[PDB]
Amino acid sequence: FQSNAMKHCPITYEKISDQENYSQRGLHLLSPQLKNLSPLDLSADEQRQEAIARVGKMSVQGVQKKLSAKLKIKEGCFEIVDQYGQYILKPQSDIYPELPENEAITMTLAKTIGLEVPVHGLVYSKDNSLTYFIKRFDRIGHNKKLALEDFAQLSGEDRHTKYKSSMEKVIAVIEQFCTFPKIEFVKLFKLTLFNFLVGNEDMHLKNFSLITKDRKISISPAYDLLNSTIAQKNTKEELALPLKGKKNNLTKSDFLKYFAIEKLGLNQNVIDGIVQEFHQVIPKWQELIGFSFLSQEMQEKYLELLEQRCKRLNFF
Numbered sequence: 001f002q003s004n005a006m007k008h009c010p011i012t013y014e015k016i017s018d019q020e021n022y023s024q025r026g027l028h029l030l031s032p033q034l035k036n037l038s039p040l041d042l043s044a045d046e047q048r049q050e051a052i053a054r055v056g057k058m059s060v061q062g063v064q065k066k067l068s069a070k071l072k073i074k075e076g077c078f079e080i081v082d083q084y085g086q087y088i089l090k091p092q093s094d095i096y097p098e099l100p101e102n103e104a105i106t107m108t109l110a111k112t113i114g115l116e117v118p119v120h121g122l123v124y125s126k127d128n129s130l131t132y133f134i135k136r137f138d139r140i141g142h143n144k145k146l147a148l149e150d151f152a153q154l155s156g157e158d159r160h161t162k163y164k165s166s167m168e169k170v171i172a173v174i175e176q177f178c179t180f181p182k183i184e185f186v187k188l189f190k191l192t193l194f195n196f197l198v199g200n201e202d203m204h205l206k207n208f209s210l211i212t213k214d215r216k217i218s219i220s221p222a223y224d225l226l227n228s229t230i231a232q233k234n235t236k237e238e239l240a241l242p243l244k245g246k247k248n249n250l251t252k253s254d255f256l257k258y259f260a261i262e263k264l265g266l267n268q269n270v271i272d273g274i275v276q277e278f279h280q281v282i283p284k285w286q287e288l289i290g291f292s293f294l295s296q297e298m299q300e301k302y303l304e305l306l307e308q309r310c311k312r313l314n315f316f
Contacts, residue, residue: 008291010130011121013108021124029119030135036076040089043127047091050080057082060136061150061206062224064099066090069133078123078133084142090132091125096231098298100132103226105292105302106198107134109285113277115190116221122293130293137221138211147212148220151205162204167192167243170208171263179216185264187219190274193255196238197278197313199229199305204240230301252313279315282306 009016011026027034042050051058051065058066068085069078078087093099104122111117120134138146152161154173171188178184195203203225211220229235237247244258260271289302310316 004296006293010104010123010293013288013291022121026121029121030071031073034071034073034076037123038075038077039124039126040078040131041126042080044092044125044129044131045094045127047089047125047131048094051091054080054082059085060088064090064093064224084139086136086139086141088134088136089123090134092129092131098294099226099231100130101293101295102231102298102302103132103224104130105289105294106200106225106227107222108288108292109198110191110194110222110225112284112288113190113194113281115187115194118221118223134223137223148209151208151210154210155205157205162206163240165205166241166245167239167259168263170205170241173208173210174219177210177217179218182265184219185266186270186274189260189264189266189271191222192243192259193274193278193313195225196250196255197306197309198225199227199302199309200225200240201235201237202226202228202240207240227302227305229305230298250312255313275313278313282310282315 007016007018008014009023009026010021011029012023014023014025016023022037027037030037040047047067048065051067054067058068060066060068067080067089068082069080069087069089070084071086072079078089090100090103100122104120107117107120118135118137120132122130123133125131138148151170151173152159154177155165155169157165174181174184174188191203207224209220210217238250239247243250244254246254256271256275260266285306286303289299292299294302
C-alpha cells in the first residue's frame with residue numbers, strides 16, 4: 001500500500017502489535033480504568049460539521065474546528081458534549097494536511113524536552129481518519145474551571161488579536177502578572193527555542209495564557225503546538241511574533257544572547273544547560289517522528305526542517 005505501516009501507539013508511540021490500536025500505558029494515561037478506546041462514531045466530515053454547529057457553546061478559544069468531549073470510562077469511548085467537557089477533539093482539516101497527526105507528534109516532542117504538556121494523542125474515527133485529542137487543563141471533572149486568560153486579554157489587545165504583537169510584549173505580560181516571572185522566563189525560553197526547531201511559525205499571542213493554580217499565576221501548560229510550516233504550501237516567516245524586530249533570519253545570538261540574556265536575564269549556566277538538553281534530545285525526536293502517524297512525505301518535511309534549524313543554532 002502507499003501508506004507506510006503505523007506500528008506504534010497513537011498516545012505513547014511505544015511499539016504495539018498490529019491487532020492493537022493503543023498501548024495499555026496509553027489507555028491508562030486517559031484513565032487507569034480505561035480498558036479500550038472505541039473509534040469516534042463520526043467521520044472527519046461529520047466531526048467538522050458538528051464542530052461548526054457547536055461553536056457557540058465552545059468555551060475553549062482557537063480558530064481551528066474543535067469539539068468538547070467527555071471520556072466514558074466504563075464504555076470506553078469519547079462522547080461529544082457542550083457542557084463540562086474534559087477533552088478537546090480536533091478533526092482533520094478540510095484544507096491543511098495531517099493537522100491532527102502533526103499536532104500530536106509536536107506536543108509529544110515538547111513533552112520529551114520537559115515542557116508542561118497535557119495528556120494528548122490521536123483517536124481513530126469512523127472513516128479511519130485520526131482525530132487529535134487533548135485533556136483540558138483548566139477543569140477536572142465537573143468542578144470549577146481554573147482562571148485562564150490569554151495574552152491578548154492581558155496585554156490590552158482586542159480579542160481577535162493574534163499576530164500584531166511581539167515577543168517583547170509577551171515578556172512584559174509575564175513581568176506584569178506572573179507570581180515568579182523568572183521561573184516563567186525559563187519556560188518561555190525553552191518554548192521559543194522549541195518552536196524555532198520544530199517549524200512552529202504560529203506561536204501567536206493567543207497561544208500564551210496565564211493560569212491561576214497552586215497559589216501562583218504562571219504560564220499555562222502547552223496547547224496548540226504544531227509544525228505549522230510543513231502544514232502549509234508556502235511560508236515566508238519563522239516566527240509568529242517578532243523577536244528583536246525580526247520574524248525571519250533569526251540567528252543563534254538573537255536567541256542565546258539578546259533573548260536569553262538581555263531580555264530574560266538568564267544566567268549562562270542555565271542557558272548552557274538548556275541548550276545541551278536540546279542537543280541531547282534530537283535523536284529521540286527524530287526517532288519519534290519516524291514512529292509518528294505523519295505520512296512519509298510529512299515526516300521527511302519535519303526532519304528536513306528540524307535539521308536545518310539545528311544547524312542554524314550550531315547543534316552539531
